[PDB]
Paper text:
Spermidine/spermine N-acetyltransferases (SSATs) are catabolic enzymes that acetylate polyamines and are critical for maintaining intracellular polyamine homeostasis. [name] is an [name] protein found in a variety of bacteria, including the human pathogen [name]. This protein adopts a dodecameric structure and contains an allosteric site, making it unique compared to other SSATs. The allosteric site is located between monomers that form the hexamers of the dodecamer, and some evidence has been provided that shows when polyamine binds to these sites, the dodecamer tightens.
Our analysis of the spm-bound structure of VcSpeG showed these two regions form potentially significant contacts: π-π interactions between F32 and F149 and an H-bond between R25 and N152. To elucidate whether these residues could be important for stabilizing the interaction between these two regions of VcSpeG, we created three point mutants: N152L, [name], and F149G (R3C4-R3C6). We substituted leucine for asparagine at position 152 to retain the overall structural similarity of the residue but remove the ability to H-bond, and we substituted alanine and glycine for phenylalanine at position 149 to potentially decrease the ability of this residue to form hydrophobic interactions. During our kinetic analyses we found the VcSpeG N152L (R3C4), [name] (R3C5), and F149G (R3C6) mutant enzymes still retained reasonably high activity toward spm. The catalytic efficiency of the N152L mutant increased slightly (1.2-fold), and the [name] and F149G mutants decreased 1.4- and 5.3-fold, respectively compared to WT. Our analysis of the spm-bound homology models for the R3C4-R3C6 constructs showed all three retained spm in the allosteric site. On the other hand, when we replaced phenylalanine with alanine (R3C5) and with glycine (R3C6) at position 149, the π-π interactions between F32 and F149 were removed and the H-bond between R25 and N152 side chains remained. In contrast, an alanine substitution at position 149 still has hydrophobic character and may be sufficient for the H-bond between R25 and N152 to be retained as shown in the homology model. The single point mutants we tested in Region 3 (F149, N152; R3C4-R3C6) were insufficient to totally inhibit enzyme activity. In cases where only a single residue in this region was altered (R3C4-R3C6), the disruption to the activity was far less.
Numbering used by the authors:
A (entry chain A), E (entry chain A), G (entry chain A), H (entry chain A): 2 to 170
B (entry chain B), F (entry chain B), I (entry chain B), K (entry chain B): 5 to 173
C (entry chain C), D (entry chain C), J (entry chain C), L (entry chain C): 5 to 170
Write the structure that this text describes.
Amino acid sequence: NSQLTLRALERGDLRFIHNLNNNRNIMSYWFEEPYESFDELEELYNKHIHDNAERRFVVEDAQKNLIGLVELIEINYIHRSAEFQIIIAPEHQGKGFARTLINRALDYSFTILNLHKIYLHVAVENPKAVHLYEECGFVEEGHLVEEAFINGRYQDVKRMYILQSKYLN
Amino acid sequence: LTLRALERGDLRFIHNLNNNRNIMSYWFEEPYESFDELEELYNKHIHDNAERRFVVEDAQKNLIGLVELIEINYIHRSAEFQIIIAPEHQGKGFARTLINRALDYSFTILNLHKIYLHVAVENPKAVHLYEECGFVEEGHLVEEAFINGRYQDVKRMYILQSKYLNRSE
Amino acid sequence: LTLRALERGDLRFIHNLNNNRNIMSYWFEEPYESFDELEELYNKHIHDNAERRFVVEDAQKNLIGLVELIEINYIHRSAEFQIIIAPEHQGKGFARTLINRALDYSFTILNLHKIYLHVAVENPKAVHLYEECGFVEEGHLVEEAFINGRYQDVKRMYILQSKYLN
Amino acid sequence: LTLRALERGDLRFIHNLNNNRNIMSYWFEEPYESFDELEELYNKHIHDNAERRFVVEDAQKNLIGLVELIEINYIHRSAEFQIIIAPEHQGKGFARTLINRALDYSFTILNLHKIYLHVAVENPKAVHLYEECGFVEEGHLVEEAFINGRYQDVKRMYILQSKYLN
Amino acid sequence: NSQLTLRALERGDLRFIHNLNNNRNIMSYWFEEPYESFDELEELYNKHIHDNAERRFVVEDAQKNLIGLVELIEINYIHRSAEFQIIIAPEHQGKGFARTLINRALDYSFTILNLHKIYLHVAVENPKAVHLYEECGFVEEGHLVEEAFINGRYQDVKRMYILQSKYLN
Amino acid sequence: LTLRALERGDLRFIHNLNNNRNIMSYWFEEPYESFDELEELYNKHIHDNAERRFVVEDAQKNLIGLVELIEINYIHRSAEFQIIIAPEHQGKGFARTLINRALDYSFTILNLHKIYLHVAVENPKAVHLYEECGFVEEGHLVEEAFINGRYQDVKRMYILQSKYLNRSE
Amino acid sequence: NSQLTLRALERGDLRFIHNLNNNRNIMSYWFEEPYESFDELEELYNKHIHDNAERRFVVEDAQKNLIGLVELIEINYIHRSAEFQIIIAPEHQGKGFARTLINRALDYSFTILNLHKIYLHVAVENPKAVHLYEECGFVEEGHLVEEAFINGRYQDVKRMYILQSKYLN
Amino acid sequence: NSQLTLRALERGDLRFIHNLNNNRNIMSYWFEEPYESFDELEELYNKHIHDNAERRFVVEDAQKNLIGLVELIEINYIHRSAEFQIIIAPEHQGKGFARTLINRALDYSFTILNLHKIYLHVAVENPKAVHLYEECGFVEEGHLVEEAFINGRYQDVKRMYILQSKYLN
Amino acid sequence: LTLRALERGDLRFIHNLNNNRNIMSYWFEEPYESFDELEELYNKHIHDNAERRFVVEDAQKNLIGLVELIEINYIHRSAEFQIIIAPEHQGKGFARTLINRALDYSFTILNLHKIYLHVAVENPKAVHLYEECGFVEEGHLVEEAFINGRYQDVKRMYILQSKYLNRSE
Amino acid sequence: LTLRALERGDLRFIHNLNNNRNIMSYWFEEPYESFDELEELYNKHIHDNAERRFVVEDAQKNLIGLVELIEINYIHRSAEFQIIIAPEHQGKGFARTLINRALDYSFTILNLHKIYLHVAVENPKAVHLYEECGFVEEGHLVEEAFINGRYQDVKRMYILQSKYLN
Amino acid sequence: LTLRALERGDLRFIHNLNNNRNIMSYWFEEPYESFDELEELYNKHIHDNAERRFVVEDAQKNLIGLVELIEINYIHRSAEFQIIIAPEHQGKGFARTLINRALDYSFTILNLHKIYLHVAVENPKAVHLYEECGFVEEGHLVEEAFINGRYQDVKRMYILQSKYLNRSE
Amino acid sequence: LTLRALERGDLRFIHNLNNNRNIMSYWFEEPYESFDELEELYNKHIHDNAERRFVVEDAQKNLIGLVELIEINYIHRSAEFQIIIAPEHQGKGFARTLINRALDYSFTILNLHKIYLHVAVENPKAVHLYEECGFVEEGHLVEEAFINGRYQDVKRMYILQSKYLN
């Protein structure tokens, strides 16, 4: 876990992004723009190469095996907020990397960019994921009713947050 | 009461409404403060369908207020609702009528499934007004906004298409 | 009654016709609501030949209604027809004379083979008028349009160049 | 069989599928014939969401066919469906499993209400297969398509999100 | 007739072009581009302001009454050819202006631009117009079968020509 | 025999065909003489539907000739036909087969009503070849082209959709 | 003083900006771009209409007499900093407006944009201006040696600051 | 001589153009644009790829040895004129190719493009070149005094011409 | 008499001058016939220094004529001269004065070495007028222009800088 | 007398000053003659800092003359100076007060080290005035300018920031 | 030791240097984190002279570090200095040599008058290093930067052109 | 020795000549330092005729030096001259033969009247060589160049087309 490294996303890593969106049954977005094919993603990356609303970091190990991804979106510098998301490759989902990657993301958000609040969304029907984030410091602030259409049915999603104060202290 | 799509001529009425608010005003997720800044971003997003705004005026062309629909996603069929009545006609009882006619357009024309909005916790008069129109609280965002030199909480209330169109049946 | 090619000055009348229809208005398969959005869309598609619109006006030049041809396909030689008469002169019985001249332009100048249209099921009076003008049903599209918070069926009627020109 | 988002490298397979169809091919309602014209049209509409195409391939990744969604309207939540299987694997009975997955993507992710398609009248075998997949006729378009020097009728069949998702 | 004058077509004259195409029941073209409304014509004129494939001259009298129009299209300088057309306002069609305007057009084509051949097209069912051109020097060179779709039916058109040699001698 | 839409790679084969002609070659009514001039105008009119060209090749990719459809008007439903067989396979009897397959595409796919072509009067072998395929003379254009230092006449022959599809019925 | 109002800068106010830069003997900048004439300023305003690095507010009284100007430049949202400047018309310089305009600017910076630190620069040879700012809450943090070339000689400038904490408490 | 062939100028031939302008001590032009380096020529060729005012043909033999160049400039299709020029490589200047290349150029000008007059310019101090052209059919029409600045001194140049009539008869 | 650089407002006066000529008028080697065609090409070549034109007017703003310098080459230091006096003031004896003042600008400001012009052989009055001003015939171009349906000859006369500035010394 | 930054409205006065000079006028090292050519060149170089021009006007705002700085180099900190007074107020002795204020702007705000200028040899009165203002000759350029059909010599005079600011 | 202007090929070496810093890196006042983001902003500001950077390498092309000059104002003749030596050659004593050669370029080539820099107060080793090279403290910016989750102070040191070039005289 | 028009491939040699000069290098009056900045500036001014540069190379094609003409004015017919020889072949005495051919191109093809140049005062050996080639001083520019932290004087020498062509 300590060997894991985070690196700024490069064009070469777009293939890894495409592979991770396979068999997830949810439309993928790139700066709030839908995409499906590798070519559509590559164009959207070239377009938003300069945008500051989102940042992404690839997660690798010592031997540079692509572990997962860390995304920050809806980044606002006036209110100092950002939506956090994390995607771990299926082959590494059950190895406990998630917790460390969550602290790595909070570290980058609250120590460098100096953001005030980090919020995230979790499906209500994955309580193990909710409890994980709670053990990491997050806490619920909303229960969005029928917010996401997942697998052919509207579903609720928990919005949980954590402030810069608690993480730094 | 009559609702009309916003024309470029009504932009000044929007700027005037933003004078008393004392909050950072946005136009398609882009900050603005001068009337000229607004007019240019209006010419830029005249075709963008991510947001739609309607100005309401009396029978004889007395502009009363404004209703806005932002963060419009036609895949999730959602949108954020907001309304601002001029201080002149603020307490004449026009609010609820504009709200219902806004939700009517969202649920009968655009065929949207969910409509949410945000209100500061320090103004319970608005919280009860929307709750009287069918909105229900789905979140209590902690320290979401920075108002007058302090971080404050925000209530997120919602209303669904099914309820608005089938409740009296 | 006289039909005239749609000009930029008539876009105001278009915006008024869409004032009380309770359905999203399109311009070359692109939505719009405000007069400014329409004016820009017109200047964008001013040369696109996939759609053609004529304004019908009285002898005094008082605008009466509108006739539109959309989805114009010159390979299969077909196009969709739509007609909107102002509420002021809706029941003056002018509708038929407008439908005929429209079909005349379609089958005499543009040289199109088929002309279809869509009419709501819950408005049988329009179905009869169209039928009496020469149209015949060819489809009962199920839940094709979302009107007033509920999907509704729509009848698709057609008319060939042969029946109008013998 | 596995469906994959259409890439630029697959445009060659598209041009081969259109090789022996005897009808003009379109890309976002724009005609084309050569592989160069198609490649430019794709780069032009690479971000347009009005159409979506998936390539179906074997376990060995041998391309088998194509499934397309066109006329995608997110307001009325509808789209037209089309499927083309290569002649090599036309009669292997895979057609049904392709139609279902397509409807699955339409009604599970994009959240569309209706899906319609058009099939020639003189090919009843396709009408039966579509019917057995869940489709039901809603229109008999008269002389809607010009095939082999003669206008021919076309049946329009539909299927709602309700029947597929209960 | 001798008082008639020909002038290069200006933007202001586009209204006269539009008025002449009323009740002619044939699609109007501007540099092989279809148009119907005044605005569509004005745009096409601005576009082809510089093109050399076609020239047009307005026909006026002493008191500047708009008499008609003289068009040269499909102008090719390698083969030295051009298709001639003439449109006279309905109020002046039966006053004998046509003959002089035909000589004026031939004069400009064979004396200035120095073209070799001028051809034109006439409906087979207007023999009075054919005989007119023959009396002016033209002669048939083709009987195009079902070349034009006029008033709801394909119709034949006579193609008649005349060379620079005969006009100059 | 197999007809294929012309790709950019076949442009050299077109230039080679224009070597023996000794006539000004055009591309969408634009003159060209160098292979590079052709390639640039090809990139310019790749989307223009006013003309369509097909290259025919043997069973094992031996490019034989070319068939062209120019002046395509989808309102009048007309088009000018032309065919050029390489000097290698010139007298192998492939012409009539390419002609019929060209008219078949024009009358069954594009749904055109009339197809005309042009041939020099000084090559009666071509005049009889087309006449054997259904074409009929509709015009004898006098001094229409300038060939080898002299003005020559040109025959315009035509064939209709009705005849091509209904004659053997 | 209490009647003074601050308004977002509009294009019409550019004339007031030009008048204030008269007889100040220092090159004027607009988003770090030099200018002298009214036309050069107007162009630079149109260019940076959308930039977020600087904001400016016109200062008016009850009767809308142009009092002065309030400028925020070098605005950085990551470090939350901004350089403050104030220009009062010569006819209003000795009426005590400065103090209130300083609090108005700090109010907008620390209560809306939520910035952490506001710094400014003062000529060392204007101690009355330095003492003013100190009485307003500022304090020196640097004595830049020969930083500005004023009136034909390099001169030192005091850099004084104040944090959001003290102003809000 | 009979084996010589003329080919339309291609981009690959621009190196031959550059080599021929070596040690000629006169500024080279490309569509009335000066150039010296290979890169400047290549850009000007890409620019005027489509211009019709000039045409150029490379002269090769049976074994494709680059013999010379044939240039037509100032081509006007209204007056039907063109300035002719010919450049033979130094290794082939004294082999009698000039005469045949002159007839080849006249053949292309008077038989294909159908031009009326071909004029050329010759230095007065090269009478052998003047007599050559006279033997080819040209004749003097002007003695331009101090028209060209050659090798550090203004010099006269003979303008000689020939019409399409004499060449064709 | 006073010469003034041509402004856009004088373009109509140029078009009027081209009415009586009955010859193809050009603007930077580009044909034009309508006033709008002229105005657009004027906006296109406002910066082109290949040609320069001056309008002359009386003491009280009575526009008399025009003098033009075209084909200006600053390497060879040459230019073609032409002058057109309105038919109103045609025979008032102003020509020679405008000519000398044109050559004065060419030889004293632009520092040109040679000035040539062209005149039809069928107007000896102009030939003698220029010859009286210092011009000398250097060429008799045979069938250079096509005037009123016939090819005619043109005289090219010239005058040198040395003569114009040193002859009376 | 008051100097003001050159505006677009003053371009007319510029064109009048060049009316009777008998020499080609330049704008940012680009020739021009007509007011339209100048107006476009100004809009092109409105942000170029290589040149700066001030209009001097009376108390009544009657334009008197012009002062220009060209070839402005901020690395070597130098610039060429030129002054043109209208013929109406040429001999009113205002020239000196204009030269000084110009040098003041060059050496007090822009922080330039050297300022040079060029004056014809055949006009010694201007050479004296410049000399009396602080300038000193540094070059006798031989046949550098072509004036009235003959190359003429030009004197280049200079002045440093040190002599003006002690 | 040899200093060289930075080429596009050296951009990767810059990104590597920014890995160990753990601070937001900028390029012409624009944030970046990915190598591709850097490369695009490099192509954008290749002409911008507001900043200049030099890469230093050993005698045999061993890239050691980088020296940067930003906020270059040629009117005030100032600039901010910064240097980053790779961790490999960090403590080899190369720093002072690169500093002096940077100030030499700033004071002898660009002819700048003042050079300032910034250093964190929590690294006195750098403060003394610059002080040993001639830099003197002119400011102690309080809570200027946000480093590792806390606001920290920054020292601004400066050195003048006169001192660097005249002190040993 | 042979002079050749400067190509894009020679820009590398240009960047090497500027490697050890200790002064800012310009390209069409625009500063640059890196090879990438120079390559873009060349493509920008590849057609500008205000400057012309020739590369001089040996018989073996080993690059020896460079000759440049800048500030080319075709109205007054003048231009500034500069020559740079690589340190490898600086003292081989080739300098004179290069200066002559340059002046030959200026006065034989471009038809220019005057050619001036600038040489530092503290390098009298170059002043003598230029003088022996035909140049004559016409100006002693005072503190015109900032070299090695100190303003230095520069001599401006000239040569007319008449003296070179009699």
